[PDB]
Amino acid sequence: VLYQDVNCTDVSTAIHADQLTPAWRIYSTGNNVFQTQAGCLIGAEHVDTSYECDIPIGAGICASYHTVSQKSIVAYTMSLGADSSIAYSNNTIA
Amino acid sequence: IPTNFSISITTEVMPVSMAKTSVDCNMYICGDSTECANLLLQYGSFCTQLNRALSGIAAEQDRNTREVFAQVKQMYKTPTLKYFGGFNFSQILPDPLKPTKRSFIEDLLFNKVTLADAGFMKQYGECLGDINARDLICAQKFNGLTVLPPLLTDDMIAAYTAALVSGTATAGWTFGAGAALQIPFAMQMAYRFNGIGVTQNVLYENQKQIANQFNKAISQIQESLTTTSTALGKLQDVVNQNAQALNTLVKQLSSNFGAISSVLNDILSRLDPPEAEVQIDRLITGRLQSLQTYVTQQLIRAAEIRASANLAATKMSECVLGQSKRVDFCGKGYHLMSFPQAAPHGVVFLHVTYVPSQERNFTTAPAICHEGKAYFPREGVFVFNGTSWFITQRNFFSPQIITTDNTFVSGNCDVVIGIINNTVYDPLQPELDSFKE
Amino acid sequence: LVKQLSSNFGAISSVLNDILSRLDPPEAEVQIDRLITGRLQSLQTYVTQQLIRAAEIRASANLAATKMSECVLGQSKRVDFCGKGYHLMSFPQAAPHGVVFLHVTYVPSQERNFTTAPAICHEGKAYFPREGVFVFNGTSWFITQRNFFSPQIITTDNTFVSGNCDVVIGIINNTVYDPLQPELDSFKE
């Protein structure tokens, strides 16, 4: 799930106290990832790695479906691009 | 024919993105009243359509921003020298010692248009902040108007701009065709001149002068962006239009559309439900009309911003990723170079244009008949003549002698009008005369 | 647009022929006027959305027609307009309510490091390359082109005359070749 704009401190309380309106019967909460363009990423792990943006969430954070250890949804820094090794030289021609 | 050159640099501000707004019609109209929501549900799924339209606008803005900025495959590292062939590339690449990861020009751009109408942020709610500072102040309002942060952060935009500048300065211009071919900057400028029409002599023999002119133009751009007025008018006008639209929506929210009061939870407390529904229906209709007008205006503005973003992406792909011979497309005169710069919800290009210099009157010669055959000029198009003396090029003086390598054979002399009788030179005859005799 | 037709715009029922058999004509007037106004507003919103989508499709069609006229009907030197790199060809294909082009682009291949030479002063005059822009040199050896290797020897036909050698920074001393002198020395001498 991805709440539009929340603090990830009141949503958890409303879920644990049955105060949220879209309260599903088989819904739970295992982890919260508070960041810009919030939503707490309930059901996804915030991995410190970087992969190509598959599902654009917002604020530089995206989501995909990779294998942590198994297949699950993660969150990365959008991997803005692959690194290069092009160095300037005044006597090198390619 | 011009006798000198003048390396000028022009600026062009083009918006590529707008304010990603999100208005919850369930909170804007019928904030917390249950009977109000029950009456609103009778009018149909207008709120769902408006939310879908706003989400589509946000997705279109994100896609336009990505297509404009994210155009290269690899992220080329910014060089540490920043001084290639005499051209001082400072204040363009991110400084490795400055706290911010932007350049001086990018800092000047972000410190002159980011006012965002200071004083109107209290109207709508926004979940601003950053996860790095661990503050992340998440503010909300009763009107339901929210502003979603963009996908590409300012840091990623600055990184894309730095990668573009590195791929333009270093590796020449072949980085846009899906490759990476190393080449010095002086040879790149010589090839740009050759593509324009100017020979490499003006570049190599006057490299120091061109570098000094480029540095002076960079300094003039810095001065014009430091303390001036009426700068970055496009982005400022876009922000002002967005703020005015939000303010008009907020004012239309607190409008008494022929009812007892314009504020909710005030007519449900002093009136009876059968007598209050009549007043609720008028307010609901008025707010629905106002929100529909706002959504239509937002769609029109989003289409305009998408067109501007497509134009800016085309300009970038034509001027930064290569050398376009399009007249008055990149800059004022000859393009000859292009450097993009990051800007809030827009792109500011730095077209290093080529402008001629002081001129001089000369004499023309359509053709020259040496021994009965006319000799029309080669690639060097202008036959500069004191009195039928030499043959030169167009964009520069370049005094060069007339030989058989600069002219080709043609018909007689009575076919071209205005032909001037003169003599042609050929290095073969004196060489053979010196070798034999 | 279909689902909005069955919506109670402040009336008793969103289905015709039902409010006329249970209400009075004077009340049925307003009961029908409310539904008429609601349906007119919904249809106006639909027409506005259709106009916006039609303007977008018209812009896309103009862009596609420009791309076709620039890539299929000729050879455009536009950078990253037809395909990825150099255009070099274009083939259009029919598609439902759209056009699918086949840009046969030109992409470079594996590279190799070489040495540069801004100018070559043979006997006091610097020979700048005329056509072949890249002076491929093992150690000041040859002159080639940019988009391909094409190993070609440096001659006087691929270079022109210029000033002295103390004007260009980075000039490498080398020798130029002219086919006239060996031919003359072989024929006469």
Curated annotation (Swiss-Prot), chain A:
Top-level division of the source organism's lineage: Viruses
**In what way is this protein post-translationally modified?**
The cytoplasmic Cys-rich domain is palmitoylated. Spike glycoprotein is digested by cathepsin CTSL within endosomes. Specific enzymatic cleavages in vivo yield mature proteins. The precursor is processed into S1 and S2 by host cell furin or another cellular protease to yield the mature S1 and S2 proteins. Additionally, a second cleavage leads to the release of a fusion peptide after viral attachment to host cell receptor.
Question: What effect is documented for mutating T13A?
Answer: In strain: Isolate Shanghai QXC1
Glycosites? N7, N90
Location in the cell: Virion membrane; Host endoplasmic reticulum-Golgi intermediate compartment membrane; Host cell membrane
What protein family does this chain belong to?
A: Belongs to the betacoronaviruses spike protein family.
Other remarks on this protein: Tor2 is the prototype of the virus isolated during the severe SARS outbreak in 2002-2003. GD03 has been isolated from the second mild SARS outbreak in winter 2003-2004. SZ3 has been isolated from palm civet, the presumed animal reservoir. The spike proteins from those three isolates display a strong affinity for palm civet ACE2 receptor, whereas only the Tor2 spike protein efficiently binds human ACE2. This may explain the high pathogenicity of Tor2 virus, whose spike is highly adapted to the human host.
Question: Quaternary form?
Answer: Homotrimer; each monomer consists of a S1 and a S2 subunit. The resulting peplomers protrude from the virus surface as spikes. Binds to human and palm civet ACE2 and human CLEC4M/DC-SIGNR. Interacts with the accessory proteins 3a and 7a.
Task: Relay the domain remarks.
Answer: The KxHxx motif seems to function as an ER retrieval and binds COPI in vitro.
Q: What is this protein called?
A: Spike glycoprotein
Biological source species: Severe acute respiratory syndrome coronavirus
Gene giving rise to this polypeptide: S
Span covered, complete protein: 596 to 695 of 1255
